[PDB]
Amino acid sequence: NNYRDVEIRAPRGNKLTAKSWLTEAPLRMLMNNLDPQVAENPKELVVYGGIGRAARNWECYDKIVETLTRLEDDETLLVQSGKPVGVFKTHSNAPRVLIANSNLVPHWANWEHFNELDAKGLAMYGQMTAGSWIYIGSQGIVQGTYETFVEAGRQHYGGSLKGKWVLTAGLGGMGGAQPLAATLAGACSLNIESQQSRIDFRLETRYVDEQATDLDDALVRIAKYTAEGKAISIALHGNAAEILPELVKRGVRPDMVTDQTSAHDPLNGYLPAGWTWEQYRDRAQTEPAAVVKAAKQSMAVHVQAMLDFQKQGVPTFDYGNNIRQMAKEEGVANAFDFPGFVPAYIRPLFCRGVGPFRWAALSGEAEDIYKTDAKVKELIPDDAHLHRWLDMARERISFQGLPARICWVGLGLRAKLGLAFNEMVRSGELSAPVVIGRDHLDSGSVSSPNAETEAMRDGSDAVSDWPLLNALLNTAGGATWVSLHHGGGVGMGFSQHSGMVIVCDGTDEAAERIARVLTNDPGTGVMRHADAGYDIAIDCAKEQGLDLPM
Amino acid sequence: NNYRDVEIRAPRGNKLTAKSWLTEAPLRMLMNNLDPQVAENPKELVVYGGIGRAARNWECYDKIVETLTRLEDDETLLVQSGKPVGVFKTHSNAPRVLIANSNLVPHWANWEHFNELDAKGLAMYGQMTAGSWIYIGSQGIVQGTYETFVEAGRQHYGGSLKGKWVLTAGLGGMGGAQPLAATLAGACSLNIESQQSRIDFRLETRYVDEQATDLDDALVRIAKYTAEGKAISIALHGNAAEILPELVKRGVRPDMVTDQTSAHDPLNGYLPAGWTWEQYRDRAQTEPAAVVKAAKQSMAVHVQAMLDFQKQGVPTFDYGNNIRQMAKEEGVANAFDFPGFVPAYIRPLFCRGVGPFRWAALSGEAEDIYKTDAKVKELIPDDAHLHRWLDMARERISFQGLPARICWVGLGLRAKLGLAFNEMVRSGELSAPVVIGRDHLDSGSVSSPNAETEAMRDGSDAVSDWPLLNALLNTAGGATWVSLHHGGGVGMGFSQHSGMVIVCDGTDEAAERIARVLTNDPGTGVMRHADAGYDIAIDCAKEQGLDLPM
Ligand SMILES: NC(=O)c1ccc[n+]([C@@H]2O[C@H](COP(=O)([O-])OP(=O)(O)OC[C@H]3O[C@@H](n4cnc5c(N)ncnc54)[C@H](O)[C@@H]3O)[C@@H](O)[C@H]2O)c1
Ligand SMILES: NC(=O)c1ccc[n+]([C@@H]2O[C@H](COP(=O)([O-])OP(=O)(O)OC[C@H]3O[C@@H](n4cnc5c(N)ncnc54)[C@H](O)[C@@H]3O)[C@@H](O)[C@H]2O)c1
Ligand SMILES: O=C(O)/C=C/c1c[nH]cn1
Ligand SMILES: O=C(O)/C=C/c1c[nH]cn1
């Protein structure tokens, strides 16, 4: 049903399968989302973050690939929670694919109802980029995690994190980026992961450096390495709900604490203390309500450990998995005494429309991306932080599936880069068309009170009109495929966000769509923060010449 | 900032204030939504359904009118909860305005949080067509209420309703259509309403015939007219929470029972038993929490009375105001023993894409609608029910604000009508362009478990992907203005729905957009119900040649 023993990888080269590049792109990106080197559990259509899938089930997967292949340049495919439900006439400048995943009427917006619908074959969790086909392995979130650690270091350790270490958990698709991000930020790290296969995955993709043999050994390495001013990431096989409380008991003092286990989903993404991942998976089907409760009780203990570390003065933050909320519902009243990573460290970037901007080379050529890297340095000649990030990505980020690049940039530069990339496809510099996208985590594409829009200065945390407008505007502007998801990141009920991907096929038509959607997409973000009253966003809006009526 | 002592009415004739008809249309309809003859309390920007508003406040109202006035042909205004927050470049075949009102992240989708936001000047409830500018007074819902009664009559009373009577309450904007709908369906009716001014509004607009002086006088009139085979509506000043329970106790037996008070918003639309509307609105801002408690306690008793009538064999149904939910939450465990109006009576019509399709003459001339009435009969020459509806409308439906017409037709005919009207504008048969829209209650534009999607056969009630896809597709196809609202009809947390309006300016460009959007819009409705498994929808899909992959 949801299992098929096959290996899927995106077609390479310039030979189309679909009718045009605008339809070949989503077809290749859907497949890239399931590439064995990219996705966590693709045989079950799982890309990342708990049960974030690319298609509802295999029959729907087959139908999506079949429909996408026949889709015309003036037709638009509607994908409803991982299922191709309809094809309607639009035009060549409208999106070829329109996607709405996991959306539920609020009163029924919970995992329990979602699970009920899933059992009836009526649901699919799109996470953020899983159901919208713009996932590129751990590289997708790595720059954001890096920026979060860098900013935390600037705020608490006057700059460099040399000799310092981060304590966290979760080496899944996105969590796996934590160790490399810590390392690139100059810190060592103790990354606790309950599944050996995931630690192996991070090692194979060179995102974590080594694995300790036990807790004491892990601490001996951290002690050695930190004393040496080295930045080495260490994986520790175990349960966060057991280890963090133990380290607190021992008086161990990390330099910064966070967590990235899939706490957003108690049933499938967080292991109860003392359970094996195998007991967890079986019981989840037997006593789901009981599994959920055990998962949340451990989260309570886990967050209480995080609070104790904070009480000791160690910078502590929630990294968007909604674990505080879970802990809080389980009795930990002061669960929100430590902040989310955005209001604490990243919001300033969102005010300038800066976010996880990304692109992938459909050709599959590593050199296509290197060429784009060079072009960006040429287009942004005076940003040493950015040039250093591109260097680090080139030297330390290994490609997963189709070569792709994560490069944080905001309002103004996104379109500059996009038009430039389109010019490179046209001239033949890039061997094949490239797709520009981003995570749904971005300045104007997400409303999530426990993550991206936590503590907005005006109290607008829960207002979700913005992401809806971003998707609508992206559709009007001409992105190649637009999406509207629910619950990505923090789980059912806590978020609404949009996605967009636009194809640079070297044509003049593309350049026309690219100029406006890459101005509008980040523009809605600047707009959204200027509306909230952020001076940085209002200044950016003015400098970029945004037309903000009020 | 929320009250302004002025009378607003849509500009008339052919003179343009905006730069083109595509931008003049939303400007005129916005104003039309506030016509003294259309809205329920326009001086407070209130259009209908509790606190459903056309703009957030008067400052934002002027700003939208202003922006709409200068908006270019390739620009798109973004309206966020009734606020003109930004303008971005798109293209002439995309919507001029993208509207997103009242959307809140699920976990915070409740009146309590909405009110907090409203107080901080951060919200506006758009109901369905209030904030989307396509409300045409009581005529908007009347045929739908009429169809519901006709169908209930075919199901329970052999067909025609001669000598039968309906018992209901709420003579507000939409509720005011109940008495006339009953009459057009051939039944008498007792409509209880707590505000005399509202009873006067329906009387002046010809939606209700007379006012009893009390319960006994009312019962004497029902008994008399019913025995005589007459079809007259009676208004009765009072509180349904008191009247219904009383009638149950007297052994009175209506032939059909329902309700249309604004139970969806306890704080603003439902008078507690024994309270004067004066005390109600004063205490609303004094002890809101207490007022909500009081209002809901009355809803419980009201629903119980309704449950009692059903026990007596009286066909009873919820008419989309979420009163059952409120009663259930108030201890009335079996509050859902009587069904919502769509699964019981209207769903088959939705399966064919039939719904509250309508259009308005921007000219302001009645003869423009009369010409469309005649045109419709010409294009649908073999639908006597349709013709009979047009005759009754011309006969009993008084125009409100700009001459408009409600006309239930579905997949296929909508585009036939839209293209014809466009051609009448082009040839001059029609004074000025007409706008074609609908309510958000329609086949593929709303998910509402306690209303439009109540009891879907596959249990997909809460799936809200559909309306988001409808809005996305309408944007892609070329509607003039597209909207996505939250909580219309049933209130905060219980619904998500889209809206659309397309202008027919006689242009070929408008022509190509009409063919697409007027096919796609109802098309998503047939798709949505076909997906749920309804054979009637599947057949319609096949007849109309819809492209539904699965
Ligand atoms: N805020 C944002 O916008 C944002 C962005 C990306 C990801 N996220 C969230 O980050 C979290 C992780 O993402 P992912 O892709 O790595 O999820 P994942 O399911 O691919 O991996 C999660 C890992 O957590 C491990 N784990 C679970 N419980 C554990 C425990 N008690 N001790 C040690 N390890 C445990 C699991 O073994 C798994 O390997 C998710 O909640 C995801 O939603 C948020
Ligand atoms: N299901 C749908 O798609 C749909 C469509 C249209 C309207 N509705 C709903 O129908 C309801 C009414 O709409 P509206 O436009 O008339 O709202 P409204 O606010 O304009 O009018 C409500 C009327 O109810 C009266 N009232 C309140 N409590 C009363 C009581 N206890 N006894 C007698 N009268 C009482 C008020 O005086 C007022 O006249 C709302 O809940 C609205 O959302 C649902
Ligand atoms: O980096 C990505 O591709 C998406 C990461 C994400 C954000 N929210 C949930 N997953
Ligand atoms: O007919 C209209 O103008 C809208 C009626 C409506 C639907 N839901 C709430 N109000």
Q: Could you explain the architecture of this structure?
A:
The structure is a homodimer of 550-residue chains. By secondary structure, chain A is α/β, with parallel strands linked by helices. The first copy, chain A, folds into two domains: 1-137 and 346-550, Urocanase fold (3-Layer(aba) Sandwich); 138-345, Urocanase like domains (Rossmann fold, 3-Layer(aba) Sandwich), CATH 3.40.50.10730. Helix content of chain A is 43%, strand content 13%. Chain A contains 18 helices and 16 strands. In chain A, the strands form three sheets. In chain A, strands 3, 4, 5, 11, 12, 13, 14, 15 and 16 form a nine-stranded mixed sheet that branches. Chain A has a five-stranded parallel sheet with strand order 8-9-7-6-10. A two-stranded antiparallel ribbon of chain A has the order 1-2. In chain A, helix 5 links the parallel strand 6 (165-169) and strand 7 (188-193). In chain A, helix 15 packs antiparallel against helix 17. Chain A is globular, with a radius of gyration of 22 Å. The structure holds nicotinamide-adenine-dinucleotide (NAD) (2 copies) and (2E)-3-(1H-imidazol-4-yl)acrylic acid (URO) (2 copies). Residues 49, 127-129, 135, 140-141, 174, 356, 439-441, 488-489 of chain B line the site of one (2E)-3-(1H-imidazol-4-yl)acrylic acid. Chains A, B: Catalyzes the conversion of urocanate to 4-imidazolone-5-propionate. Chains A, B: NAD(+) binds at residues 49-50, 127, 173-175, 193-198, 239-240, 260-264, 270-271, 319-320, 451-452, 489. Chains A, B: It is an enzyme of class 4 (lyase). Chains A, B: InterPro entries: Urocanase, Urocanase-like, Urocanase_C, Urocanase_central_sf, Urocanase_CS, Urocanase_N, Urocanase_Rossmann-like, Urocanase_sf. Chains A, B: This is Urocanate hydratase.
